[PDB]
Design a binder for this molecule. Sequence first.
Ligand code: 4PJ
Ligand code: CA
Ligand code: CA
Ligand code: CA
Ligand code: CA
Ligand code: CA
Ligand code: CA
Ligand code: CA
Ligand code: CA
Ligand code: CA
Ligand code: CA
Ligand code: CA
Ligand code: CA
Ligand code: CL
Ligand code: CL
Ligand code: CL
Ligand code: CL
Ligand code: CL
Ligand code: CL
Ligand code: CL
Ligand code: MG
Ligand code: MG
Ligand code: MG
Ligand code: MG
Ligand code: MG
Length: 653
Amino acid sequence: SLLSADEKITESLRSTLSDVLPDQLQTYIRTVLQFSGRPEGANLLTGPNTEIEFFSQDPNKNFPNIFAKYSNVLTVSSDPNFITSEDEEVKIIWGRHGSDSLIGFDPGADLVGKRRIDIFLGDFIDEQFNPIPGALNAGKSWSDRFILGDWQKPYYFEDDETLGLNQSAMILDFNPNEDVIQLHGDRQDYELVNISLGTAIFWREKKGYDLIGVLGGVSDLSLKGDYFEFKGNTAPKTVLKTAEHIGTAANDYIFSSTVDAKGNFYVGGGTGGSLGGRNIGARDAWLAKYDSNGNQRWSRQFGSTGTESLWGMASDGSNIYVAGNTTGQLENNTVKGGNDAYLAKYDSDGNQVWIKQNGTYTLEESYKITVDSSGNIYTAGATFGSLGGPNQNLEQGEVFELPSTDGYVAKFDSNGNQLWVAQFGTITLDDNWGVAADNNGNVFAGGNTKGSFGAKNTGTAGEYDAWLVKLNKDGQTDWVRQFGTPNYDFMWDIETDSLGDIYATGWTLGDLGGKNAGSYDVWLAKYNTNGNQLWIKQFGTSEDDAPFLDGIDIDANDNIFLTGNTNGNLGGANAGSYDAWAAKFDKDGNQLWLKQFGTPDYDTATTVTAVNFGKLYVSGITEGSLGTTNAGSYDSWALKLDADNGEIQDFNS
Ligand SMILES: CCCC[C@@H](F)CCCC[C@H](C)Cc1cc(O)c([C@@H](CCCC)CCCC[C@H](C)Cc2cc(O)cc(O)c2)c(O)c1
Ligand SMILES: [Ca+2]
Ligand SMILES: [Ca+2]
Ligand SMILES: [Ca+2]
Ligand SMILES: [Ca+2]
Ligand SMILES: [Ca+2]
Ligand SMILES: [Ca+2]
Ligand SMILES: [Ca+2]
Ligand SMILES: [Ca+2]
Ligand SMILES: [Ca+2]
Ligand SMILES: [Ca+2]
Ligand SMILES: [Ca+2]
Ligand SMILES: [Ca+2]
Ligand SMILES: [Cl-]
Ligand SMILES: [Cl-]
Ligand SMILES: [Cl-]
Ligand SMILES: [Cl-]
Ligand SMILES: [Cl-]
Ligand SMILES: [Cl-]
Ligand SMILES: [Cl-]
Ligand SMILES: [Mg+2]
Ligand SMILES: [Mg+2]
Ligand SMILES: [Mg+2]
Ligand SMILES: [Mg+2]
Ligand SMILES: [Mg+2]
């Protein structure tokens, strides 16, 4: 019976949210939701007002740590939730700009009996907090997809004698004119109830009801509305049986790839399941080796009871170096506080040689790694602390400036000894999305900034620009460059060619290398070793086109390969939702080919690696059945392409 559902839902959500979320975070959230005009969730947080310790050096009190522990803050891009992990009872999942595919509940995780509330914000963009109107994106919003179930099962589903209040989504900014709520089954499986908070979505069967989600501030919806997408009960039909399929019942992601000197191909990423080994807890890091004929030689899985991923990998020709972040304590290491970065070394036989966990009392992230021809290793990332030197935003002064990251680069020898760490940026946000060594002892880094790092930012409201830094063999800066439009421009990855010139790829909402075709467009920029911008190419469709994650590689012939996602007809007719794409360019930016592939469901490439004089590998993630039947939520895939024309080959030969 749905009698008194309103009262029961409010008391359940209030009790769980107020029991789980720290008082500092409750105080912060209450302030934000009231200021923003999304106040429905506020009365659910009843902890006392508490001083927010934005700059505490105690890892347990440091507010960036607290906020990060209970949130997935996504990017200005159209994001899948690439950071989701079953490590907390309550999570705030914040899509920000772009058309986000928002998930927080892993249907393959053992969550029986666990309290689970995912609080979703599809947009709630940064511009809402602008004291001054007129910013280019003020008042803009995007179609976000809130994933509350799929072909396999409803999410947040306890399937018991209660109303199923212990697990539920709470979507705070659902706009039925733009957004979509994705549900398992069909409309006859649900009942909507108007409640004080908005709308309750109940799964309904003969034996009773189970609360799947609450939509704050919206009432009088219809399950016949096109803003509900029902997924039935049957896994998607398989396409691209030529691909290598990697998947478990849980969320599985390839985030990076590399090749060794013998042509063996490696992939890796994160998994909520038991992919390379038995799951240790929440998301673990994993990697796998394939021979050049496509046979898997081994898979390995590592981490902690907390959350970690492999975000980058590279080879010295034999060994495989891997980099990412962790929320826990890795083997043979000590935590530095909050989230930390790590570098690890695997030999060609899959033996873990060592792991080095590094960081400060506050949050580090690290998505990038490169290995030079001498065998030294560079990682890069961002830090809220003072890792390579004092953070540009050290403490709170008379003018408050929100705690913010600087970029860093760290150099290591083959035994994992740290040779130096460099840190740089502005008082505001500076993130890292690239690292690449040249042949002459230098290393480049790149990323995004809200500030004026290498040049005056032409945005009027702190919109992102791209930046590049050249460091010498000792970690000293030789130059800093910055480029962009007045709108958001976002870098994903960088790489050098055989001459030592530096290339970067990303997306733009403006006219960076030419007239924007619509929405997000792709760019490729080239700088010489002396910091001169040589050219920027921009291309796309009228729809949303972007590289993603490990989006560039350069082969021994100085051909450039890019990869990412598009919801347009970029390389061909779109199969449905976002598809993957890849492209090849020469060193002067002439585009040699452009291909698109995927399933009728959401796909994105995440990594591209070219074998010198061999095959091209494009790998990524999907909600569809790519290679074989989807085993649960996100699965991953690798495609072997002919590098001359982008045509897909059978993975196994
Ligand atoms: C209920 C909804 C809450 C929504 C909102 F309340 C959350 C504020 C959390 C703030 C937290 C204490 C710390 C933090 C800061 C940070 O920058 C980032 C970056 C990631 C870059 C570093 C890896 C992405 C998110 C930027 C969003 C800014 C609003 C943009 C900004 C930055 C800035 O430096 C100055 C500004 O004025 C505005 C975090 O992920 C977490
Ligand atoms: Ca986004
Ligand atoms: Ca969004
Ligand atoms: Ca939206
Ligand atoms: Ca439920
Ligand atoms: Ca783990
Ligand atoms: Ca840390
Ligand atoms: Ca900074
Ligand atoms: Ca810009
Ligand atoms: Ca476009
Ligand atoms: Ca790369
Ligand atoms: Ca697709
Ligand atoms: Ca899966
Ligand atoms: Cl971002
Ligand atoms: Cl706004
Ligand atoms: Cl109940
Ligand atoms: Cl209805
Ligand atoms: Cl099939
Ligand atoms: Cl082997
Ligand atoms: Cl600045
Ligand atoms: Mg029930
Ligand atoms: Mg296979
Ligand atoms: Mg097989
Ligand atoms: Mg201004
Ligand atoms: Mg390479």
